[PDB]
Amino acid sequence: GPKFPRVKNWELGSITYDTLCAQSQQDGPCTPRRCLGSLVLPPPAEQLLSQARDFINQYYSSIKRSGSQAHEERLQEVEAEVASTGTYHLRESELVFGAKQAWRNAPRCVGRIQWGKLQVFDARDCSSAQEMFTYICNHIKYATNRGNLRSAITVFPQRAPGRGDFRIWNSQLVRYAGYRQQDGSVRGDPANVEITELCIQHGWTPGNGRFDVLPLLLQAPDEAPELFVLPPELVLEVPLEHPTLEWFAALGLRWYALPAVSNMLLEIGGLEFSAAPFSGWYMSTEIGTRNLCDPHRYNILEDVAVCMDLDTRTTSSLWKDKAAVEINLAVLHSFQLAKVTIVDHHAATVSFMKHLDNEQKARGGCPADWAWIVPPISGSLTPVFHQEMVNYILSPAFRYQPDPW
Amino acid sequence: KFPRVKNWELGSITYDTLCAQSQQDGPCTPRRCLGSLVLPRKPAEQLLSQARDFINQYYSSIKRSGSQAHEERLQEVEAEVASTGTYHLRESELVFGAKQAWRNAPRCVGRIQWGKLQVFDARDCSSAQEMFTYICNHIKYATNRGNLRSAITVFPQRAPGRGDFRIWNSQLVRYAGYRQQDGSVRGDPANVEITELCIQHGWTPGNGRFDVLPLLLQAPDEAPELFVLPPELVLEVPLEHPTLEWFAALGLRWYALPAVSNMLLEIGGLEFSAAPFSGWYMSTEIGTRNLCDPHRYNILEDVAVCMDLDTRTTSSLWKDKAAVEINLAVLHSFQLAKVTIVDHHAATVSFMKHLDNEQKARGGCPADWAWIVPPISGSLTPVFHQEMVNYILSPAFRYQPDPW
Ligand code: HEM
Ligand code: HEM
Numbered sequence: 001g002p003k004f005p006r007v008k009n010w011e012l013g014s015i016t017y018d019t020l021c022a023q024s025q026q027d028g029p030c031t032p033r034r035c036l037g038s039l040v041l042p043p044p045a046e047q048l049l050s051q052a053r054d055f056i057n058q059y060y061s062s063i064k065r066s067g068s069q070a071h072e073e074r075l076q077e078v079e080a081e082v083a084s085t086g087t088y089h090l091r092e093s094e095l096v097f098g099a100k101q102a103w104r105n106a107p108r109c110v111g112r113i114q115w116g117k118l119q120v121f122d123a124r125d126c127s128s129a130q131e132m133f134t135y136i137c138n139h140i141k142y143a144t145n146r147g148n149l150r151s152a153i154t155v156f157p158q159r160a161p162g163r164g165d166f167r168i169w170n171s172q173l174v175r176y177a178g179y180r181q182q183d184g185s186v187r188g189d190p191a192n193v194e195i196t197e198l199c200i201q202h203g204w205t206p207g208n209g210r211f212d213v214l215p216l217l218l219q220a221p222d223e224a225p226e227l228f229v230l231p232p233e234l235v236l237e238v239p240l241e242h243p244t245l246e247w248f249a250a251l252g253l254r255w256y257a258l259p260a261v262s263n264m265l266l267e268i269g270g271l272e273f274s275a276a277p278f279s280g281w282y283m284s285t286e287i288g289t290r291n292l293c294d295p296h297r298y299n300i301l302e303d304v305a306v307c308m309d310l311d312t313r314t315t316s317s318l319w320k321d322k323a324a325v326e327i328n329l330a331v332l333h334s335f336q337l338a339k340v341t342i343v344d345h346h347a348a349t350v351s352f353m354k355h356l357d358n359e360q361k362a363r364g365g366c367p368a369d370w371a372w373i374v375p376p377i378s379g380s381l382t383p384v385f386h387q388e389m390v391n392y393i394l395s396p397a398f399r400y401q402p403d404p405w
Numbered sequence: 406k407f408p409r410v411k412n413w414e415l416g417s418i419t420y421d422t423l424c425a426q427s428q429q430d431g432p433c434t435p436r437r438c439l440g441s442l443v444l445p446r447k448p449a450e451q452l453l454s455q456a457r458d459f460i461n462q463y464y465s466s467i468k469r470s471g472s473q474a475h476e477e478r479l480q481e482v483e484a485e486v487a488s489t490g491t492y493h494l495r496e497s498e499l500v501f502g503a504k505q506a507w508r509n510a511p512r513c514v515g516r517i518q519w520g521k522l523q524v525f526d527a528r529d530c531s532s533a534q535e536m537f538t539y540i541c542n543h544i545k546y547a548t549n550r551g552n553l554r555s556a557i558t559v560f561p562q563r564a565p566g567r568g569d570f571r572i573w574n575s576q577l578v579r580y581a582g583y584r585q586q587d588g589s590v591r592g593d594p595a596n597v598e599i600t601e602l603c604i605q606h607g608w609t610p611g612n613g614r615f616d617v618l619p620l621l622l623q624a625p626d627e628a629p630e631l632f633v634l635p636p637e638l639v640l641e642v643p644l645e646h647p648t649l650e651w652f653a654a655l656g657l658r659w660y661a662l663p664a665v666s667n668m669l670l671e672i673g674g675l676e677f678s679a680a681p682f683s684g685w686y687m688s689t690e691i692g693t694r695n696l697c698d699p700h701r702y703n704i705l706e707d708v709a710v711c712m713d714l715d716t717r718t719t720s721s722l723w724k725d726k727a728a729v730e731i732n733l734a735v736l737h738s739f740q741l742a743k744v745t746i747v748d749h750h751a752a753t754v755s756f757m758k759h760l761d762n763e764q765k766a767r768g769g770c771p772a773d774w775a776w777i778v779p780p781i782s783g784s785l786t787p788v789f790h791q792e793m794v795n796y797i798l799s800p801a802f803r804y805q806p807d808p809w
């Protein structure tokens with residue numbers, strides 16, 4: 001009947017229609033000829049204005065004053081500002097709304113049930129790399145909260161015409177070093193080889209552990225990036241042990257508490273925030289499956305399987321599956337023991353299903369990237385696997401941006 | 406124009422140029438991607454061009470493009486369509502077409518096997534009774550005492566203004582699902598509807614969890630007929646577990662032969678509404694989806710309790726632990742019974758090789774990531790880390806409406 005994508009849940013037999021996708025102003029990578037959904041990575045005053053008008057409309061709607069005098073005056077104010085400066089500036093509450101809407105709009109995030117609970121730190125007054133470090137340390141302190149983790153974003157000054165960007169060079173605020181060895185292998189996190197060598201080129205004295213916390217490379221406008229070492233007491237980590245396998249603790253594994261992505265671009269109303277780090281808490285599979293077991297990450301699956309005395313000589317023993325499960329259990333158990341916020345992939349996907357239903361009512365749909373939403377272990381054991389999803393780009397948005405170097 | 410395809414484990418990059426050969430629209434648009442949807446929302450010059458294109462594919466395959474035989478065949482097809490509005494395939498063309506359709510199936514992880522397919526021509530079928538004989542032979546051939554062999558049986562194509570030949574069941578072997586009035590379902594819930602259709606067409610039902618359904622076979626414009634498969638034809642594997650002695654006591658089992666029977670085979674514009682095909686199972690289909698899906702046999706909690714796991718909380722990973730043991734039991738049991746089966750690691754590893762073979766052969770390979778990646782231990786398999794391009798090539802297997 002309805003001229004909108006029909007979305008089915010095959011577990012429950014229920015049907016919805018996504019009408020929200022009609023609000024998408026930006027094309028993705030797919031066409032009627034081929035679907036590129038699995039691909040990881042696929043102003044003129046006029047363009048800015050329409051984006052800005054769209055956002056201001058979004059803002060006034062969200063506060064139920066659409067069509068009002070203050071709405072029309074804000075529109076006039078934004079246009080006039082662009083008229084004389086080529087850009088414009090957000091009011092504080094507009095920044096807060098946009099930051100939250102960016103998260104709410106993120107198709108790849110399974111944690112969006114939490115989207116309304118986001119502490120927005122306005123750092124648009126920051127004017128140095130040293131000052132960025134202060135703001136970041138404060139973010140880490142607040143967000144970590146001794147293990148009772150709190151979602152937060154710190155927004156630094158927006159991209160400005162004829163002036164360099166504020167950039168955090170590191171992909172997350174907390175990252176383990178990856179040291180390339182003489183034998184070609186990697187000690188530490190192979191994901192972080194490039195940033196590690198960049199840190200060294202910039203005067204960092206490197207360690208040689210598997211879990212050396214990297215220093216921050218922070219870049220203020222039109223300046224070389226400066227190197228900042230995080231005070232270790234600010235960086236909460238959890239040593240990994242297993243509830244029953246006593247040898248697991250002897251592996252010396254660990255992960256940091258705070259997932260704090262820092263290389264993403266926050267776009268709101270056409271304004272571009274090139275440095276706006278944000279953090280929540282981990283879903284246990286990110287650490288236990290991906291970071292610890294990916295072939296091109298720590299790759300600990302065989303080591304653990306051997307300790308479990310599994311038959312690693314044949315696929316059909318399911319040694320990989322068994323080990324992966326116990327590694328994930330260790331992550332959950334250790335985070336719980338340490339009283340550091342974490343969520344398993346069952347609890348998380350269940351809560352995302354609740355989120356989908358909320359957004360169905362609130363907005364007529366929810367953009368979602370099935371491949372990213374479904375967890376990397378136990379896929380069909382979670383409800384989201386059986387849930388069809390429509391993927392599309394809404395704005396405000398978090399966007400990938402090229403590396404500053 | 407041409408999609409850049411990256412593998413994130415190895416850093417390697419391909420470019421898919423095969424997708425330019427797609428003549429059929431999928432469900433995605435620039436505005437929104439619908440790749441996770443399971444089913445699609447919904448003259449003679451058209452047929453003639455699909456026909457020419459296919460005959461072209463065929464003669465290129467035998468390396469005789471531009472040969473007089475190729476040219477003569479094109480005129481044959483053209484002459485037949487111009488006169489009758491349709492045409493017919495030579496057996497050798499049908500055999501090529503069927504293999505290509507498997508090859509082009511974006512959702513199939515087992516396509517490394519594509520060139521190895523026994524094709525039974527059943528186009529000289531005029532009755533449900535004859536369909537039954539062909540089906541029995543197919544099952545006999547394909548089962549081969551546990552040494553499974555991939556096969557397809559092809560029934561007469563669709564004709565204008567005439568009902569279709571159809572097999573009503575979704576697979577040649579399916580377990581009954583009986584809806585007990587107390588809300589529940591005994592058996593396989595996926596088969597409630599087909600079970601009920603069977604009963605209304607005269608089948609005396611069982612009352613078990615693994616009662617093998619009769620086939621409802623339909624010749625054109627006739628009511629379907631009921632046929633009970635001879636039990637000796639249907640090979641089943643009792644499930645036990647290598648170390649957990651109690652597992653066998655669950656009374657679990659599954660059939661050897663996965664033989665899908667409700668898909669339509671399109672070749673060169675011609676449509677074969679009844680063309681059942683079979684290979685062998687990947688263990689996760691049985692151990693994860695069929696046995697553990699909440700809307701299937703849903704045995705997770707039962708197994709977990711037997712393993713004395715803490716069911717109270719999600720964070721004990723009782724679901725993940727139980728699922729792994731069930732998958733192991735399926736593998737163990739099939740191996741013990743000498744019945745062909747492939748685990749999801751072996752399967753996905755061979756699929757990566759297939760992607761590589763196809764890159765060299767055709768310049769790409771249509772694949773549906775969401776279906777290729779197994780339902781447990783996704784990122785533990787190489788396909789998780791492989792970008793894939795999805796699109797429709799012909800010959801193709803397609804979904805079609807239920808005939809009732
Ligand atoms: C509060 C608890 C949260 C949980 C459990 C959570 C969970 C996740 C997970 C599992 C992913 C997939 C990441 C990967 O596989 O690498 C993800 C992605 C993402 N998250 Fe959330 N998240 C949370 C909070 C947040 C917050 C506070 C923000 C921003 C305000 C956010 C924005 C995003 C974005 C933009 C992505 C996509 C990343 C990409 O494409 O690279 N998340 N999230
Ligand atoms: C020989 C061993 C084979 C293996 C191990 C295998 C594996 C699989 C698996 C795991 C799926 C996903 C099915 C599901 O989740 O329900 C699938 C789908 C599919 N397979 Fe294969 N397969 C094999 C042979 C074949 C053959 C012989 C054909 C046809 C001649 C075929 C054509 C297809 C098609 C068309 C689909 C998609 C069905 C749909 O979209 O619902 N496969 N295969």
Ligand SMILES: CNCc1cc(OCc2ccc3ccc(N)nc3c2)ccc1Cl
Pocket residue numbers: 111171172191259261279280281282283286400
């Ligand atoms: C393109 N950058 C890839 C990349 C993504 C990363 O994480 C994505 C991401 C983003 C936001 C998250 C929020 C919460 C959470 N638990 N995980 C989250 C994970 C981390 C490092 C890199 Cl290098």
Ligand SMILES: CNCc1cc(OCc2ccc3ccc(N)nc3c2)ccc1Cl
Pocket residue numbers: 515575576595663665667683684685686687690
């Ligand atoms: C309409 N229901 C869809 C459906 C799809 C099914 O599987 C598709 C399918 C097709 C070919 C296969 C080949 C081999 C294999 N192991 N599984 C295969 C699975 C099975 C039953 C049903 Cl009921």
Ligand SMILES: C[C@H](O)[C@H](O)[C@H]1CNc2nc(N)[nH]c(=O)c2N1
Pocket residue numbers: 038039040371372373413789790791792793
């Ligand atoms: C090729 C594929 O898109 C890629 O490996 C994706 C798949 N799904 C994912 N899902 C999440 N949550 N995170 C990821 O990094 C990925 N990687």
Ligand SMILES: C[C@H](O)[C@H](O)[C@H]1CNc2nc(N)[nH]c(=O)c2N1
Pocket residue numbers: 010385386387388389440441442443775776777
């Ligand atoms: C909604 C989602 O697309 C649906 O559950 C799909 C996901 N991937 C799948 N993959 C396979 N192999 N088989 C399936 O039935 C499905 N179902």
Ligand SMILES: [Zn+2]
Pocket residue numbers: 030034035036037433437438439440
């Ligand atoms: Zn798509």
